[PDB]
Design a protein around this motif. Structure first.
Motif, PDB file in Angstrom:
ATOM      1  N   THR A 121      49.617  46.608  45.995  1.00 27.16           N
ATOM      2  CA  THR A 121      48.623  46.786  44.944  1.00 27.16           C
ATOM      3  C   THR A 121      49.302  47.219  43.651  1.00 27.16           C
ATOM      4  OG1 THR A 121      48.185  49.098  45.545  1.00 27.16           O
ATOM      5  CG2 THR A 121      46.834  47.386  46.613  1.00 27.16           C
ATOM      6  N   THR A 122      48.734  46.788  42.525  1.00 28.80           N
ATOM      7  CA  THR A 122      49.360  46.982  41.226  1.00 28.80           C
ATOM      8  C   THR A 122      48.329  47.435  40.201  1.00 28.80           C
ATOM      9  OG1 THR A 122      49.056  44.664  40.577  1.00 28.80           O
ATOM     10  CG2 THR A 122      51.128  45.246  41.697  1.00 28.80           C
ATOM     11  N   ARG A 123      48.832  48.022  39.115  1.00 29.60           N
ATOM     12  CA  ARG A 123      48.005  48.424  37.983  1.00 29.60           C
ATOM     13  C   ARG A 123      48.904  48.650  36.775  1.00 29.60           C
ATOM     14  NH1 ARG A 123      49.386  51.475  41.647  1.00 29.60           N
ATOM     15  NH2 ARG A 123      47.934  50.249  42.923  1.00 29.60           N
ATOM     16  N   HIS A 125      48.422  49.966  32.428  1.00 28.50           N
ATOM     17  CA  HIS A 125      47.571  50.351  31.310  1.00 28.50           C
ATOM     18  C   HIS A 125      48.427  50.910  30.182  1.00 28.50           C
ATOM     19  CE1 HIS A 125      43.969  49.888  33.838  1.00 28.50           C
ATOM     20  NE2 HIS A 125      44.660  50.511  34.776  1.00 28.50           N
ATOM     21  N   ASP A 151      43.501  55.139  35.943  1.00 27.29           N
ATOM     22  CA  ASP A 151      43.854  54.256  37.054  1.00 27.29           C
ATOM     23  C   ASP A 151      45.374  54.253  37.251  1.00 27.29           C
ATOM     24  OD1 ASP A 151      43.650  52.272  39.084  1.00 27.29           O
ATOM     25  OD2 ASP A 151      43.928  50.700  37.574  1.00 27.29           O
TER      26      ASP A 151
ATOM     27  N   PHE B  72      37.873  42.062  30.218  1.00 23.82           N
ATOM     28  CA  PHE B  72      38.387  41.505  28.967  1.00 23.82           C
ATOM     29  C   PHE B  72      37.370  40.493  28.443  1.00 23.82           C
ATOM     30  CE2 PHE B  72      42.898  42.904  28.436  1.00 23.82           C
ATOM     31  CZ  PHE B  72      42.914  43.804  29.488  1.00 23.82           C
ATOM     32  N   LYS B 126      45.374  39.467  26.992  1.00 27.77           N
ATOM     33  CA  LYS B 126      45.772  38.497  28.003  1.00 27.77           C
ATOM     34  C   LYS B 126      45.799  37.102  27.395  1.00 27.77           C
ATOM     35  CE  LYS B 126      43.845  41.061  31.932  1.00 27.77           C
ATOM     36  NZ  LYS B 126      43.060  40.978  33.196  1.00 27.77           N
ATOM     37  N   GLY B 164      48.524  39.328  34.397  1.00 26.70           N
ATOM     38  CA  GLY B 164      47.230  39.976  34.432  1.00 26.70           C
ATOM     39  C   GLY B 164      46.172  39.097  35.062  1.00 26.70           C
ATOM     40  N   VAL B 165      46.478  38.542  36.230  1.00 26.55           N
ATOM     41  CA  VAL B 165      45.550  37.679  36.948  1.00 26.55           C
ATOM     42  C   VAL B 165      44.652  38.533  37.829  1.00 26.55           C
ATOM     43  CG1 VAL B 165      47.053  35.672  36.869  1.00 26.55           C
ATOM     44  CG2 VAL B 165      47.261  37.293  38.762  1.00 26.55           C
ATOM     45  N   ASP B 166      43.396  38.106  37.968  1.00 23.88           N
ATOM     46  CA  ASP B 166      42.484  38.753  38.904  1.00 23.88           C
ATOM     47  C   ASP B 166      42.778  38.291  40.330  1.00 23.88           C
ATOM     48  OD1 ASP B 166      40.875  39.486  36.345  1.00 23.88           O
ATOM     49  OD2 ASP B 166      40.670  37.303  36.438  1.00 23.88           O
ATOM     50  N   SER B 212      48.925  43.952  36.015  1.00 24.72           N
ATOM     51  CA  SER B 212      47.926  44.897  35.538  1.00 24.72           C
ATOM     52  C   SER B 212      46.837  45.174  36.565  1.00 24.72           C
ATOM     53  CB  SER B 212      47.296  44.392  34.239  1.00 24.72           C
ATOM     54  OG  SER B 212      46.571  43.194  34.461  1.00 24.72           O
ATOM     55  N   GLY B 213      46.851  44.477  37.693  1.00 20.01           N
ATOM     56  CA  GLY B 213      45.855  44.692  38.722  1.00 20.01           C
ATOM     57  C   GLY B 213      46.063  43.699  39.844  1.00 20.01           C
ATOM     58  N   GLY B 214      45.409  43.983  40.968  1.00 19.57           N
ATOM     59  CA  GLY B 214      45.484  43.095  42.110  1.00 19.57           C
ATOM     60  C   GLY B 214      46.760  43.276  42.916  1.00 19.57           C
ATOM     61  N   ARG B 215      47.127  42.209  43.629  1.00 16.97           N
ATOM     62  CA  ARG B 215      48.249  42.240  44.561  1.00 16.97           C
ATOM     63  C   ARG B 215      49.326  41.214  44.220  1.00 16.97           C
ATOM     64  NH1 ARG B 215      43.756  43.992  47.267  1.00 16.97           N
ATOM     65  NH2 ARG B 215      44.065  45.715  48.750  1.00 16.97           N
TER      66      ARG B 215
HETATM   67  C1  LIG Z   1      43.900  41.857  36.343  1.00 17.20           C
HETATM   68  C2  LIG Z   1      43.033  42.977  35.853  1.00 17.20           C
HETATM   69  O1  LIG Z   1      42.681  43.088  34.688  1.00 17.20           O
HETATM   70  N1  LIG Z   1      42.677  43.850  36.783  1.00 17.20           N
HETATM   71  C3  LIG Z   1      41.846  44.991  36.457  1.00 17.20           C
HETATM   72  C4  LIG Z   1      40.684  45.097  37.450  1.00 17.20           C
HETATM   73  O2  LIG Z   1      41.216  45.101  38.792  1.00 17.20           O
HETATM   74  C5  LIG Z   1      40.234  45.409  39.778  1.00 17.20           C
HETATM   75  C6  LIG Z   1      39.418  44.149  40.052  1.00 17.20           C
HETATM   76  O3  LIG Z   1      40.289  43.098  40.425  1.00 17.20           O
HETATM   77  C7  LIG Z   1      38.460  44.463  41.201  1.00 17.20           C
HETATM   78  C8  LIG Z   1      37.499  43.343  41.605  1.00 17.20           C
HETATM   79  O4  LIG Z   1      36.480  43.855  42.456  1.00 17.20           O
HETATM   80  O5  LIG Z   1      39.190  44.787  42.387  1.00 17.20           O
HETATM   81  C9  LIG Z   1      39.970  45.968  42.270  1.00 17.20           C
HETATM   82  O6  LIG Z   1      40.700  46.306  43.441  1.00 17.20           O
HETATM   83  C10 LIG Z   1      40.101  46.518  44.723  1.00 17.20           C
HETATM   84  C11 LIG Z   1      40.679  45.529  45.726  1.00 17.20           C
HETATM   85  O7  LIG Z   1      40.270  44.202  45.381  1.00 17.20           O
HETATM   86  C12 LIG Z   1      40.200  45.861  47.134  1.00 17.20           C
HETATM   87  O8  LIG Z   1      40.886  45.035  48.081  1.00 17.20           O
HETATM   88  C13 LIG Z   1      40.452  47.329  47.456  1.00 17.20           C
HETATM   89  O9  LIG Z   1      41.861  47.585  47.443  1.00 17.20           O
HETATM   90  O10 LIG Z   1      39.811  48.147  46.478  1.00 17.20           O
HETATM   91  C14 LIG Z   1      40.357  47.952  45.173  1.00 17.20           C
HETATM   92  C15 LIG Z   1      39.729  48.948  44.206  1.00 17.20           C
HETATM   93  O11 LIG Z   1      40.191  48.680  42.877  1.00 17.20           O
HETATM   94  C16 LIG Z   1      40.938  45.867  41.064  1.00 17.20           C
HETATM   95  O12 LIG Z   1      41.573  47.129  40.798  1.00 17.20           O
HETATM   96  C17 LIG Z   1      42.989  46.988  40.543  1.00 17.20           C
HETATM   97  O13 LIG Z   1      43.657  46.468  41.657  1.00 17.20           O
HETATM   98  C18 LIG Z   1      43.663  47.289  42.836  1.00 17.20           C
HETATM   99  C19 LIG Z   1      44.373  46.508  43.930  1.00 17.20           C
HETATM  100  C20 LIG Z   1      44.281  48.660  42.590  1.00 17.20           C
HETATM  101  O14 LIG Z   1      45.679  48.555  42.397  1.00 17.20           O
HETATM  102  C21 LIG Z   1      43.598  49.315  41.388  1.00 17.20           C
HETATM  103  O15 LIG Z   1      44.326  50.494  41.045  1.00 17.20           O
HETATM  104  C22 LIG Z   1      43.580  48.385  40.188  1.00 17.20           C
HETATM  105  O16 LIG Z   1      42.935  49.028  39.094  1.00 17.20           O
HETATM  106  O17 LIG Z   1      39.938  46.281  37.110  1.00 17.20           O
HETATM  107  C23 LIG Z   1      40.618  47.537  37.094  1.00 17.20           C
HETATM  108  C24 LIG Z   1      39.653  48.593  36.573  1.00 17.20           C
HETATM  109  O18 LIG Z   1      38.808  49.042  37.637  1.00 17.20           O
HETATM  110  C25 LIG Z   1      41.833  47.500  36.183  1.00 17.20           C
HETATM  111  O19 LIG Z   1      41.411  47.526  34.818  1.00 17.20           O
HETATM  112  C26 LIG Z   1      42.681  46.265  36.454  1.00 17.20           C
HETATM  113  O20 LIG Z   1      43.675  46.194  35.425  1.00 17.20           O
END
Ligand SMILES: CC(=O)N[C@H]1[C@@H](O[C@H]2[C@@H](O)[C@@H](CO)O[C@@H](O[C@H]3[C@H](O)[C@@H](O)[C@@H](O)O[C@@H]3CO)[C@@H]2O[C@@H]2O[C@@H](C)[C@@H](O)[C@@H](O)[C@@H]2O)O[C@H](CO)[C@H](O)[C@@H]1O
Ligand SMILES: CC(=O)N[C@H]1[C@@H](O[C@H]2[C@@H](O)[C@@H](CO)O[C@@H](O[C@H]3[C@H](O)[C@@H](O)[C@@H](O)O[C@@H]3CO)[C@@H]2O[C@@H]2O[C@@H](C)[C@@H](O)[C@@H](O)[C@@H]2O)O[C@H](CO)[C@H](O)[C@@H]1O
Ligand SMILES: CC(=O)N[C@H]1[C@@H](O[C@H]2[C@@H](O)[C@@H](CO)O[C@@H](O[C@H]3[C@H](O)[C@@H](O)[C@@H](O)O[C@@H]3CO)[C@@H]2O[C@@H]2O[C@@H](C)[C@@H](O)[C@@H](O)[C@@H]2O)O[C@H](CO)[C@H](O)[C@@H]1O
Ligand SMILES: CC(=O)N[C@H]1[C@@H](O[C@H]2[C@@H](O)[C@@H](CO)O[C@@H](O[C@H]3[C@H](O)[C@@H](O)[C@@H](O)O[C@@H]3CO)[C@@H]2O[C@@H]2O[C@@H](C)[C@@H](O)[C@@H](O)[C@@H]2O)O[C@H](CO)[C@H](O)[C@@H]1O
Lengths: 303, 301, 304, 301
Positions: A121-123, A125, A151, B72, B126, B164-166, B212-215
């Motif tokens: 998992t990644t983040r 900001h 986050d 975004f 992005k 920065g992919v979802d 920036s998010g996801g895996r």
């Molecule tokens: C690419 C981007 O801008 N990502 C944003 C966004 O990420 C969150 C969304 O992708 C969201 C969709 O429901 O899912 C979140 O993660 C879940 C994950 O899908 C589940 O399998 C489980 O692990 O619960 C997670 C709770 O977040 C995404 O959060 C981001 O990715 C996670 C894997 C984790 O690393 C978390 O710390 C991340 O923030 O939205 C978030 C704001 O809430 C960020 O802004 C991110 O950049």
């Protein structure tokens, strides 16, 4: 038999700042009698010796790497335990002022902090690094970042990508004021030496960039003594310095004419015969060319 | 008569030529099921730049231009200039402005502005390289931001940070974007490369970009480090043959750990099977041995 | 409606722990100290429950540490330790303490075992020494240096140090009343718990004394603490208000019922007796200290 | 009548009562497939010590006595004294000398000596509690060392550090050793404990011990922290019922996080199903509420 000293053939628009990962914007000169020019990034001798906190990777100037934890509108504070730029563990005993690439100015570096956990998992900001903060102690092995987002995961690998300056008051950005690499605890040590013209009528010549600013009216002016490509070039070549001063001419390959001449000093900085703060306008295809090793008492032609 | 040389660099002293990041590792893999045709970090051994490749390491996947209007949610139109500030000409024989991203996905970074009155702004942005609004060859692309604090008709820059992919599948490092959208197909492309010897695979200089998010693993492979792009451009040494023999040497023990082919079009192959990292000691470096021919049989790794 | 009464725990001498090292108390000892400055930093507590210096509650963490091991830039292998707080929190040099809690408060070489557990669950442990006089002993700045005989240590892995005893080569390198330089040579010691001394004629300090193990040589391992760790823990819990600067205590024998001697327990957390000369204080196995009363500091103790 | 109290201690302020290390976490698990009958850290709520439990935190799994002779391939015989230096009497109604290890495995530590001529030695040592020569109830046990630098007939101390098993399965924290070897069975044991209410499991104070090699997790669970052993012994408050109600409180929010039963025999239960850690904030602590009866129904966690 003696390895010849050379410069890479680059125009102004093909050079990178050695104090921040941005292109060079212009050439600039100004008086410096009131100031101490002792930056620590972009410090190299003409025979290839790196000094200060200087390293080879362009992207790594003002970047960092390490582990984030919670500390004790940008409201969230985080403690960063720093590793070395290459991923190796950091030891404060190495005879450098601070980990290589550490910022060498007072102010706030604007950038992005990112994390990748072992579970993939990644983040990422926005984040700022206050180089004037009492918890800015990279020589000790730690610094503090500020963020707007909450986050961030503790005890996770964290990287910081520098983007520009993020000061509120423009006066917070002092490009010629070194931070305290050990905060309030110790003095700065192992510094690359300060530089100045040792000659009447000469001023330092700078490779200047305007950094991005996240808000306010900051000009983002960052002057380096030598572009990062020359850092990388001199490190590779390590040509013997025949004198303390290499004579350099800026030439226009279209007209074939010399626009001006300058001294390239062995310690890794340039001087020119000119008075007063002023940009140096060059043609787009012009470049610096090494002319000859010269005695330090050589008198440059005025501009 | 100018000899060909490689700079003496450690793995940890090399920069990715497809993104302003350091190289993290060396990697090899079978590539028959992908098209290896990236456009950044493309250089011949005699110093000719190809594709969208330019010299500044910070300018890969960066852009420069003027912004106008239209989670975004905020969309903005970017009129692109050349990285040197000069106006971009879609008539030149390049696939897109130099430094344009060469993969499908969302490039995560920061957009910044400085106005004539000296007021400034910078916020996360992005660049979706799969959107129909991604037409850098035609002189324009589109960014999305979370902040609304942007001024129209102002000088704007983009500092790339990572992906920065979802969905993790949006990032496809081996799928070129459509530089002209669906108006036409890509042109002036640097040629695709492949291994051409039995038991040989490409050798990659690998980085893991921030996400920036996801895996997303953020894995980004380039054919040669940006320092080699810069070095070959400077040297312009004539390529005596199609293939250079290169060896990786540990200076601490003096021993050669493996040998590789460095091909004239600017890519490397090794005798190795399977998707695998190549573990190298911290002080190792590539050494140019001599020019050889494509029929050389490398020692297996 | 009365104040909380000051109490001592009921413990014999063989039920007490040293507050400057994780070992039991061996004996009571008194000695003249006008020569030396008594300013140890572990086992420092006021009678109303305020901890001072580097004193903390866990008995096992005195002279222990935890952190991340790094290679340095016969016990001939040297390693760098980036110190964390004893709870895994990152260590903050800005905290108003001389050094991380539990940091050794004497000059010498602490002998112990350094251990590691990696995220892949692999583990290692081998003998190690902490030289508190080395120029790289800078715990206040967040790091120190260990030395090992074994090379089986992984860099950048979580590392703990378990203290065992002293490991000096020459016996004179162990100076229990000399404080280390917590920042090395780079800045002065800060936030020290105050020095203690008898400010009364004919009185000397009374010590709770242990003989630490030693890895070699003829070192006696003598380590004197002002107050046992059980009292550090007790006063912190009770925090009873101190009515005067001096609490009168008596060492009583529960078998005979008789008082063996009396002593002063001072508010700053140390003891004095009316005695002269370096001498152990022999006590019965079942004897213990008993709080008698708060007294004025000019109270005169009975000799011996 | 003296009221019952708990000391005010944070999770990071508690010591393991089965080994001289800090408590690392709280933990719960079903225990029907193990025998929870440790002998260190055994105390009743009214201050009675049981098993081999003593007061000194540093002396748990330590020993004291006289060494003689018989890759840790040097074997030595230890004639055990009492921790207070007095001779050990196998006739007393205890399972073994106080502080004797209460699990099967190899205790890793350091054996040290100081001779009357003041010469000293200390080197790594192991105590294998599964060996036939582990007969502390009979007054002797055996250590192995890597070093040969030990003098026979000299006073010898053992400082416990952690586990030293080669195979990870040798460390069985819930299997008591044979205190008399194969000569006879264990006697004078502190009673085994188990939850006795639907949905309730034991709550453990867990430490993770150092390990000198291998992959052993070093997990050591104790029923009650050593400070509570010391506190209840000092206080000796009458246990008004068989069960005390205790709650874990966060002072930073004033909120209760969970409630638990503290049973008279010196162990805790909670309403929870499964093997799981109990996550607690850094400033929380257990607060004694009142005496209840065993039929109390705790709120689920
Ligand atoms: C690419 C981007 O801008 N990502 C944003 C966004 O990420 C969150 C969304 O992708 C969201 C969709 O429901 O899912 C979140 O993660 C879940 C994950 O899908 C589940 O399998 C489980 O692990 O619960 C997670 C709770 O977040 C995404 O959060 C981001 O990715 C996670 C894997 C984790 O690393 C978390 O710390 C991340 O923030 O939205 C978030 C704001 O809430 C960020 O802004 C991110 O950049
Ligand atoms: C460095 C940083 O993180 N800046 C933030 C922050 O910038 C705004 C604040 O710094 C604020 C404090 O009063 O001032 C704003 O600008 C004033 C300006 O000083 C006045 O002269 C007048 O123009 O009113 C403005 C109202 O904002 C700052 O705004 C930023 O700077 C301006 C010059 C302009 O370029 C604006 O677009 C910028 O946003 O907070 C903003 C969000 O409001 C950003 O988050 C910025 O990064
Ligand atoms: C603190 C430490 O690391 N000790 C090590 C180390 O101990 C021996 C060395 O310190 C050695 C240096 O000359 O001196 C030894 O004892 C000598 C003694 O100084 C002489 O006066 C004479 O008596 O010969 C002795 C050796 O037989 C140190 O040995 C130790 O101390 C002795 C008094 C005795 O207790 C012996 O058993 C001890 O080993 O190096 C040894 C290596 O054998 C150990 O590693 C020890 O822990
Ligand atoms: C309990 C004890 O005294 N351990 C010693 C001893 O440990 C090593 C042996 O147990 C050895 C048996 O072959 O295995 C080593 O680790 C292997 C591991 O089993 C493999 O799966 C693979 O990882 O290679 C390893 C190479 O060592 C044991 O080494 C110890 O445990 C490892 C998991 C690792 O953490 C290593 O660093 C440890 O030293 O022998 C060593 C000296 O060789 C120590 O003396 C250790 O205390």
């Amino acid at each position: 038999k003696t390895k010849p000293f050379t410069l890479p053939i680059l125009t102004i628009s093909e050079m990178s700042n050695s104090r921040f990962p941005v292109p060079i914007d212009s050439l600039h000169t100004s008086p410096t009698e009131n100031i101490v020019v002792q930056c620590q990034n972009g410090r190299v001798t003409l025979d290839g010796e790196l000094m200060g906190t200087t390293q080879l990777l362009p992207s790594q100037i003002c970047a960092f790497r390490g582990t984030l934890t919670r500390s004790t509108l940008f409201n969230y504070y985080w403690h960063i335990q720093l590793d070395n730029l290459n991923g190796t563990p950091y030891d404060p005993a190495e005879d450098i002022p601070a980990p290589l690439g550490t910022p060498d100015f007072r102010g706030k570096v604007f950038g992005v902090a990112s994390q990748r956990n072992p579970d993939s998992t990644t983040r990422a900001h926005e984040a700022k690094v206050d180089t004037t903060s009492g918890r800015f102690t990279p020589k000790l092995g730690s610094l503090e970042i500020t963020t707007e987002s909450d986050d961030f995961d503790p005890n996770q690998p964290t990287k910081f990508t520098p983007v520009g300056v993020g000061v509120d008051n423009e006066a917070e950005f002092q490009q010629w004021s070194l931070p305290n690499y050990s905060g309030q605890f110790t003095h700065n040590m192992n510094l690359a030496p300060a530089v100045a013209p040792n000659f009447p009528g000469e001023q330092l010549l700078f490779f200047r960039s305007q950094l991005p600013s996240s808000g306010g009216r900051s000009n983002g002016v960052l002057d380096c003594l030598v572009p990062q490509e020359w850092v990388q070039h001199f490190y590779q070549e390590s040509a013997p310095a025949q004198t303390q001063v290499a004579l350099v001419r800026y030439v226009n390959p279209d007209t074939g004419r010399v626009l001006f001449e300058a001294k390239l000093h062995k310690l890794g900085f340039m001087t020119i015969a000119k008075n007063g703060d002023s940009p140096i306008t060059v043609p787009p295809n012009g470049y610096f060319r090494f002319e000859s090793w010269v005695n330090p008492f050589y008198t440059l032609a005025p501009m």
